[PDB]
Design a protein around this ligand. Structure first.
Ligand SMILES: NC(=O)c1ccc[n+]([C@@H]2O[C@H](COP(=O)([O-])OP(=O)(O)OC[C@H]3O[C@@H](n4cnc5c(N)ncnc54)[C@H](O)[C@@H]3O)[C@@H](O)[C@H]2O)c1
Ligand SMILES: NC(=O)c1ccc[n+]([C@@H]2O[C@H](COP(=O)([O-])OP(=O)(O)OC[C@H]3O[C@@H](n4cnc5c(N)ncnc54)[C@H](O)[C@@H]3O)[C@@H](O)[C@H]2O)c1
Lengths: 318, 318
């Protein structure tokens, strides 16, 4: 059998597992015509996000049995065209879940400890600022998690048990009782999470309800001493309302890994404040997370090519 | 009875607990002669670090039974002069261990996630470094803890279970089995902890055995990819040897909260490197930490003034 890598994988480990059992062709920097001239006599396809997979390419693929995406995004693959030709469309999500949770923990602790601000002062000979800064102790503070999914649960679990925090959670579409498996308390009114929390960490899916969910109206309800952490999606915060929340001191600070205009401009107003800490959308980027994405893509190809059902099919009708 | 507060307590809680049972005089911004003219008819003394306590002031104190420091440091109190007049010198250590534990966690995470370096770049318009930086995933990495005491145990406990790290410990004066209560494994050969660790965090007592314990010879054994965290004491590291470890890249980075010489100068050679992040001896400085020290200093005074032997006597000979 033959397997086509439409673009490189996140790590070479998945390229060797496939080449171990199949014949692998790699298309680096894929063009539209290049897919058709190689997808014909091919049994498995790996699509690196965000390159497109036409209904044309699926049709020119006659022996195609499994198409695998690089991560969570499946919006560039014609899912409808594959359910007709019997092709199984498989996903690879959540494979950077421990990486993002470690990252948000990093940012919660940095905000509480004023890590970035204290580092700059010491480096500027201003060691003496220690008489003007009070680090925050996380123990006993309440951490409100918006989105009790893969990442929110793991973040809640660590903050509730190891860090001894009171953890509240807002997630309408999660089984009531899930929060107890993780030592959080499920909350039905998001206003209650805002008024009780000293730290707010966003982990929801970007739906048509969470887009710009965190408004200036939400910020006014939060404690002046509270912080915001966002490793989810940029659009979950109305970025202009966050700029005024910091400037008007409605909020004590914020840690951001995702941006609404992404990439953010050079002239971003948030960069002005020591209040605000950034990372360039790297929360889920660790070497181990890349291998898990590569290994999960190679394993789900071999499962379909041999009979067995893979775990992440978007095509249950096959 | 009368108690003199040579300086304010870290929180008003210890001053009221003392004022509940004794007559309290407070000397804010204490001068030496002010100590001399008030320590006379007084049974207990609280000395706020770092103000001095002379053999003169101790000599002028006739009814003095207990002197209590504000924290751990007793080097500004004439302990020899107090053992002679029978006065009990009391310490206040271990009252901020959760603060240091949270602080060391902050710095381990920041080093793995390159938090400070990523923040400055994003703020400097260099969002594009995300193609050049790899955050480290803590899960599965080995954390070597030097000193399995109050802070060392707490750091181990969180890292072994919540962060899913293999935790090693080096502590010759600890019962093997203390590491087991905390899901670490106690190790007898420090060379094993240096060659196996991806992160080494120092939490030992500063003795003549740990003084400059971390030499250029120690750094040579660590992995080129490993990191160093020091929230203990500045002298446990030979500061010049740390600079050559960073400069010659024997080590991947370092986070320090304590310095030798302390305070660090404006021209510190470590400030050059993005590898190295600093905090100005604030690891144990949180509001909750101040209250426990205030209460513990006020309680060890009332313990001596009522019969009971206090827990932290530097004067066991009475
Ligand atoms: N490198 C990165 O920054 C990175 C990496 C991975 C994921 N993420 C982002 O983190 C976020 C969380 O990821 P995940 O894997 O936990 O997703 P998930 O699918 O496992 O869970 C998302 C949760 O959001 C909840 N939710 C849905 N609508 C909500 C609403 N209106 N209000 C509150 N909660 C709602 C859902 O019930 C679900 O429990 C996602 O937006 C994802 O894109 C970022
Ligand atoms: N950065 C801060 O603000 C701050 C605050 C409090 C304490 N500290 C420092 O952190 C360190 C740990 O504090 P603690 O409360 O856990 O003290 P601790 O006495 O409870 O633990 C220190 C450990 O050092 C161990 N040790 C002694 N000699 C050793 C050796 N040769 N090798 C390995 N281990 C050895 C002892 O067995 C002890 O267990 C101390 O040096 C303390 O001064 C720093």
């Amino acid at each position: 059998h033959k397997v086509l890598l439409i673009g490189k994988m996140y790590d070479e480990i998945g390229e060797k597992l496939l080449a171990e059992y199949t014949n692998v062709e790699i298309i680096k920097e894929p063009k539209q015509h290049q897919i058709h001239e190689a997808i014909q006599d091919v049994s498995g396809v790996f699509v690196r996000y965000p390159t497109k997979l036409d209904a044309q390419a699926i049709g020119l693929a006659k022996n195609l049995k499994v198409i695998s995406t690089s991560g969570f995004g499946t919006d560039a693959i014609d899912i409808a065209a594959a359910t007709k030709r019997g092709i199984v469309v498989v996903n690879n999500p959540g494979l950077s879940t421990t990486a993002v949770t470690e990252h948000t923990l990093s940012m919660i602790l940095a905000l509480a400890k004023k890590l970035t601000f204290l580092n700059q002062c010491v480096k500027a000979g201003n060691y003496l600022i220690r008489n003007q800064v009070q680090p925050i102790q996380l123990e006993g503070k309440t951490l409100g998690i918006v989105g009790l999914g893969r990442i929110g649960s793991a973040v809640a679990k660590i903050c509730s048990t190891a860090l001894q925090m009171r953890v509240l959670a807002y997630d309408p579409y999660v089984p009531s009782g899930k929060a107890d498996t993780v030592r959080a308390t499920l909350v039905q009114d998001l206003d209650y999470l805002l008024t009780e929390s000293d730290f707010v960490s966003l982990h929801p899916e970007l739906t048509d309800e969470t887009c710009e969910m965190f408004d200036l109206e939400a910020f006014k309800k939060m404690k002046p001493s509270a912080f915001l952490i966002n490793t989810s999606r940029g659009k979950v915060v109305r970025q202009p309302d966050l700029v005024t929340a910091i400037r008007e001191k409605l909020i004590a600070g914020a840690a951001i890994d995702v941006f609404e205009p992404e990439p953010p401009a050079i002239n971003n107003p948030l960069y002005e404040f020591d209040n605000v800490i950034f990372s360039p959308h790297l929360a889920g980027v660790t070497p181990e997370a890349g291998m898990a994405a590569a290994l999960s893509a190679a394993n789900q190809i071999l499962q379909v090519l041999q009979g067995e059902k893979p775990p992440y099919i978007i095509n249950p009708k096959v």
